[PDB]
Design an enzyme around this catalytic site. Structure first.
Site, mmCIF file in Angstrom:
data_model
loop_
_atom_site.group_PDB
_atom_site.id
_atom_site.type_symbol
_atom_site.label_atom_id
_atom_site.label_comp_id
_atom_site.label_asym_id
_atom_site.label_seq_id
_atom_site.Cartn_x
_atom_site.Cartn_y
_atom_site.Cartn_z
ATOM 1 N N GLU A 39 0.828 -1.205 0.000
ATOM 2 C CA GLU A 39 0.000 0.000 0.000
ATOM 3 C C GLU A 39 0.867 1.261 0.000
ATOM 4 O O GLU A 39 0.851 2.065 0.933
ATOM 5 C CB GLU A 39 -0.976 -0.004 1.182
ATOM 6 N N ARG A 169 -8.835 1.133 -5.349
ATOM 7 C CA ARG A 169 -7.807 0.196 -4.910
ATOM 8 C C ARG A 169 -8.233 -1.220 -5.270
ATOM 9 O O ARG A 169 -9.303 -1.675 -4.852
ATOM 10 C CB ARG A 169 -7.563 0.318 -3.408
ATOM 11 C CG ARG A 169 -6.884 -0.891 -2.794
ATOM 12 C CD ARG A 169 -5.397 -0.898 -3.100
ATOM 13 N NE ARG A 169 -4.787 -2.200 -2.856
ATOM 14 C CZ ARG A 169 -4.505 -2.683 -1.655
ATOM 15 N NH1 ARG A 169 -4.767 -1.999 -0.554
ATOM 16 N NH2 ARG A 169 -3.944 -3.885 -1.554
ATOM 17 N N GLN A 195 1.782 -10.355 -3.470
ATOM 18 C CA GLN A 195 1.835 -10.615 -2.039
ATOM 19 C C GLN A 195 3.260 -10.455 -1.524
ATOM 20 O O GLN A 195 4.229 -10.796 -2.209
ATOM 21 C CB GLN A 195 1.313 -12.022 -1.713
ATOM 22 C CG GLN A 195 1.215 -12.334 -0.227
ATOM 23 C CD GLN A 195 0.248 -11.419 0.501
ATOM 24 O OE1 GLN A 195 0.657 -10.490 1.197
ATOM 25 N NE2 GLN A 195 -1.045 -11.681 0.344
#
Ligand code: GTP
Ligand code: G1I
Lengths: 359, 202, 57, 338
Positions: A39, A169, A195
């Protein structure tokens, strides 16, 4: 017979011609690898490049805004009671349990009965009181920009604009590449992945990229990482940056540094509340360096804060072939990426190390 | 026996170039480095037509080396100046070897020197073209490159070896050629004698 | 607790790995030596091949 | 509770270790110390294959020991001809990142994995003489590391999300799923009779699954670092594992114990790929110090070195008839030894 040999030689000649034609285009492209923490804004830049240097770039994209709206309002109400100090506001009490009822369901409340009363919570002082302090819980960084513009797009698809599309997002499924068209040789920018993994075994493959772009947030110095109570979100980036520089595989690769979320950082310092000295103990004794060129749009107080963040990153690079470049960016403003973009290009590997003949 | 020591000395020069004997810029330098036995002459010329070939070969080699160094310097400077970039050997020798065997030469005693079977008499224009034209481009291309480093020590240290060696090796020869009196005939050979040492530098 | 449930599954599988028959190493290692001696002829990498026999030369 | 469960788990580990001690009778060297060493082995480069632009990451020999397929870092699969060096095809790829390749036993399909999480499969022999995607498998997460063929309609993959699944091309869905690893999976190798297979993870461990039932059977953990490659002994009762540290070890299925350690005090580099020979007498192993070595199965001494690649060997293979040895590297060069 010899006919088979002749046919095989003809096929080999055709394949060799194809290979010779295809070799030229590969030797000229410049490849850039994005990086950063969770993020931070990596995928926003890639979408930004398409909307700037490519003429090209719908109904499916409309749906995720509604999905985002259901999550943003759910978290604020859920943390109203779970917060350690009581911050509870009797309006919309009959809707509070409705939010909890719909808080976990694959199918969202497509009916307009949800939108009419969820807007009341936004106008309610109780929800706004919780939104003032968001350090304790985890909240999406684009919650405010969507809650205000409610029911403008709920009535119909209404082809939402790019400005309202960039802030959406969406998790990265896999790799996310882009080959935009430029007057020079076209570039190949690709996202890191989906990830977070600590080992990072795939990095051995990337041993020929011209430059590595590092993207780090700057408006998150008082929030923990997704795993609760781990560390400051800025410190998790500092440890990652140090590990990247001191890597055996990356021994002759330059680094470009972007500091996004400048606007968010500007509003945080202005409105008091949490201070830098509370979370970082070494900020009190800092003095603004003389070699500073502040842009004529900031008061002297905030400018003292920007260069402290840059100083912490750059000190790591100067300790240990390798060069580092600082920059200040705000990804949503379409013009800002171009201003750095039309600038980033000029010096790297551009008259800088360009002169590989022994000086 | 001094010449014999020099005879082995110039023999050692071939080993250095042979040992060297790969990219786009390295292709040009292959011919530049690759490009003298009759120096002694007992103080020779077995064949009358054989003497002219040696002088023609020497002149052609000199002008070819000058042209090759000019080409590589210009290419490197242009590559450095502009980011994101996108036949001299035959030509130089063609206009140089032809007058040697084409009876293009120049006193009453001079004709007697040709009559007796290694006098050198004459082609300054081949000269000014061979050295002055190349040097003028060579100073200009380098001049832009040094400024680029200044915009962003070792640079001058390497540029000295790059330029001053060739300058000191060749410019005095150009000055001696333009002198043609006040210059001894035997003295002139020494200036050209050190010219082959440049081939040993590379 | 998920870890308690996770640990319960891990221990159950381990119990099955305890009741596996095993044999002596001396008889196990002797089988490897026996196999390598049987197929010594069909291995061109050890004994160099003739020029005519080798398709590569 | 948690304390009770943890206490029970530790109560079983010591029984395994104690039982393993009783199984050992004598070391491998003691029994195998009465044979003649093979001696120095020297062999040269018969042929060299050129035409790749970037590094090669994997390669595989055909079942006829005449055709090999290689995969590069620019997304180009080219099926070479070993005898005459005549390239036969050049398949482009949607994803420029590739880590695996395979060659079907029937020689009709070629499977290429990659970092895009898609284990796509191609078609070789068809009408119009073209190559096209047959199916794309996208039911998996993480990057892939290996792919293998059991028959014309079954393919096995192993990724970096600590899973190994057995697919089915026709249905395009996972038939079964294997779980239990705590680290990234890196390689696998099927049995000669195609009934069992193993897998080397990144947590210094190895396992042995069952294709039909789908459950773990043993677990070997003698290493001390990461694991990069595995191959089976031709018999099918032993497998040699190449680890990230210099040690190469050879386990045994029946004895359930490590047998020998291949290492040298003068080497501090890693292992990339290992493979046996036809008679299981040699253990060829790649290395990260720009060359390849040749060990011995029993004597554990480095008989010979193949060298001169100029870049790390990154893949390795041996033909079915044992008549050639092929290696790739990061310098875009393939070579064949004999
Ligand atoms: N207001 C504002 N929001 C920003 C800025 N930069 C990024 N964001 C928001 O931060 C989020 C970034 O999402 P992504 O583009 O996926 O980047 P990310 O969150 O790091 O996600 P990954 O790249 O997959 O790790 C989105 O909500 C963006 O709108 C900025 O300068 N200003
Ligand atoms: C004896 N060697 C000669 C001397 C004069 C001379 C050479 C080459 C090019 C010229 O323009 C010259 O004037 C040399 O090859």
């Amino acid at each position: 017979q010899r006919n088979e040999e002749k046919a095989q030689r003809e096929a080999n000649k055709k394949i060799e011609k194809q290979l010779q034609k295809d070799k030229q285009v590969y030797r000229a492209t410049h490849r850039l690898l994005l990086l950063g923490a969770g993020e931070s804004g990596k995928s926003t830049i890639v979408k930004q490049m398409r909307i700037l240097h490519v003429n090209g770039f719908k109904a499916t994209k409309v749906q995720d805004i509604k999905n985002n709206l259901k999550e943003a309002i759910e978290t604020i109400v859920a943390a109203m009671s779970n917060l350690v100090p009581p911050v509870e506001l009797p309006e919309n009490q009959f809707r509070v349990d409705y939010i909890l009822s719909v808080m976990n369901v694959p199918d969202f409340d497509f009916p307009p009965e949800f939108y009419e009363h969820a807007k009341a919570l936004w106008e309610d002082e109780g929800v706004r009181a919780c939104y003032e302090r968001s350090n304790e819980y985890q909240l999406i960084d684009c919650a405010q920009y969507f809650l205000d513009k409610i029911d403008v797009i709920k009535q119909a698809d209404y082809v939402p604009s790019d400005q309202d599309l960039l802030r959406c997002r969406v998790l990265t499924s896999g790799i996310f590449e882009t080959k935009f068209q430029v007057d020079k040789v076209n570039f190949h920018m690709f996202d890191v992945g989906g990830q977070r993994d600590e080992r990072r075994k795939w990095i051995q493959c990337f041993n020929d990229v011209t430059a590595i772009i590092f993207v780090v947030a700057s408006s998150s110095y008082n929030m923990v990482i997704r795993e609760d109570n781990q560390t400051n979100r800025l410190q998790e980036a500092l440890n990652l940056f140090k590990s990247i520089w001191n890597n055996r595989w990356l021994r002759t690769i330059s680094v470009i540094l972007f500091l996004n979320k400048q606007d968010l950082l500007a509003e945080k310092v202005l409105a008091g509340k949490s201070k830098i000295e509370d979370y970082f103990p070494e900020f009190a004794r800092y003095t603004t360096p003389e070699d500073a060129t502040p842009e004529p749009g900031e008061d002297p107080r905030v400018t003292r804060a920007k260069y402290f963040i840059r100083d912490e990153f750059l000190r790591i690079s100067t300790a240990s072939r390798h060069y580092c470049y600082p920059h200040f960016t705000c990804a949503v403003d379409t013009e800002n990426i171009r201003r750095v973009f039309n600038d980033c290009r000029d010096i790297i590997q551009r008259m800088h190390l360009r002169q590989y003949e022994l000086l | 026996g001094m010449g014999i020591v020099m005879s082995l000395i110039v023999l050692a020069i071939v080993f250095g170039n042979v040992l060297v004997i790969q990219t786009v810029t390295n292709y040009f330098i292959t011919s530049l480095a690759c490009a003298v036995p009759f120096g002694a002459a007992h103080i020779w010329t077995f064949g009358n037509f054989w003497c002219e070939f040696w002088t023609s070969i020497d002149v052609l080699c000199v002008t070819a080396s000058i042209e090759t160094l000019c080409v590589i310097a210009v290419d490197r400077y242009f590559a450095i100046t502009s980011p994101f970039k996108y036949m001299v050997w035959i030509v130089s020798g063609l206009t140089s070897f032809l007058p040697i065997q084409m009876h293009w030469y120049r006193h009453q005693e001079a004709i007697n020197c040709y009559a007796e079977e290694c006098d050198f008499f004459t082609a300054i224009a081949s000269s000014i073209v061979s050295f002055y034209v190349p040097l003028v481009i060579m100073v200009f291309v380098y001049s832009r490159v040094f400024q680029e480093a200044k915009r962003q020590h070792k640079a001058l240290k390497t540029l000295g070896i790059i330029m001053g060696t060739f300058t000191l090796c060749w410019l005095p020869f150009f000055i001696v050629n333009i002198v043609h009196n006040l210059i001894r005939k035997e003295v002139y050979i020494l200036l050209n004698w050190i010219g082959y040492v440049n081939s040993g530098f590379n | 607790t998920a870890s308690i449930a996770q640990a319960r599954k891990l221990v159950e599988q381990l119990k099955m790995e305890a009741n596996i028959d095993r044999i002596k190493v001396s008889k196990a290692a002797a089988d490897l030596m026996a196999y390598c001696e049987a197929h010594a002829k069909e291995d061109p990498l050890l004994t160099p091949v003739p020029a005519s026999e080798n398709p590569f030369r | 509770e948690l304390d009770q469960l943890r206490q029970e788990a530790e109560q079983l580990k010591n029984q395994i270790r104690d039982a393993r001690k009783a199984c050992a009778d004598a070391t491998l060297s003691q029994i195998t110390n009465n044979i003649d060493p093979v001696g120095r082995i020297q062999m040269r480069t018969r042929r060299t294959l050129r035409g790749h632009l970037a590094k090669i990451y994997a390669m595989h020999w055909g079942t006829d020991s005449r055709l090999l397929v290689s995969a590069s870092q620019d997304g180009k699969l080219i099926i070479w001809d070993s005898y005459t060096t005549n390239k036969v095809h050049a398949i482009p790829l949607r994803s420029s990142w590739v880590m695996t390749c395979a060659y079907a036993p029937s020689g009709n399909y070629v499977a290429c994995g990659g970092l895009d999480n898609i284990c796509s499969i191609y078609n070789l022999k068809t009408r119009e003489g073209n190559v096209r995607v047959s199916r794309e498998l996208a039911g998996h997460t993480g990057y892939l590391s290996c792919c293998r063929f059991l028959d014309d309609n079954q393919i096995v993959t192993s990724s970096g999300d600590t899973t190994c699944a057995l697919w089915d091309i026709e249905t395009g869905q996972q038939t079964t799923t294997f779980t239990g690893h705590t680290g990234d999976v890196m390689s696998l190798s099927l049995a000669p009779d195609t009934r069992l297979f193993v897998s080397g993870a990144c947590d210094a461990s190895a396992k042995l699954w069952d294709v039909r039932e789908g459950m773990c059977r043993q677990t070997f953990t003698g290493h001390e670092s990461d694991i990069n490659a595995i191959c089976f002994f031709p018999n099918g009762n032993a497998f040699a594992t190449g680890s990230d540290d210099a040690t190469c070890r050879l386990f045994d299925l029946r004895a359930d114990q490590e047998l020998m350690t291949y290492s040298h005090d003068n080497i501090i580099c890693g292992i990339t790929s290992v493979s046996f020979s036809k008679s299981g007498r040699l253990l060829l192993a790649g290395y990260d110090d720009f060359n390849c070595n040749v060990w011995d199965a029993l004597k554990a001494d480095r008989a010979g070195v193949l060298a001169g690649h100029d870049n790390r060997v990154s893949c390795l293979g041996v033909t079915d008839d044992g008549m050639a040895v092929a290696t790739g590297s990061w310098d875009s060069f393939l070579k064949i030894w004999n």
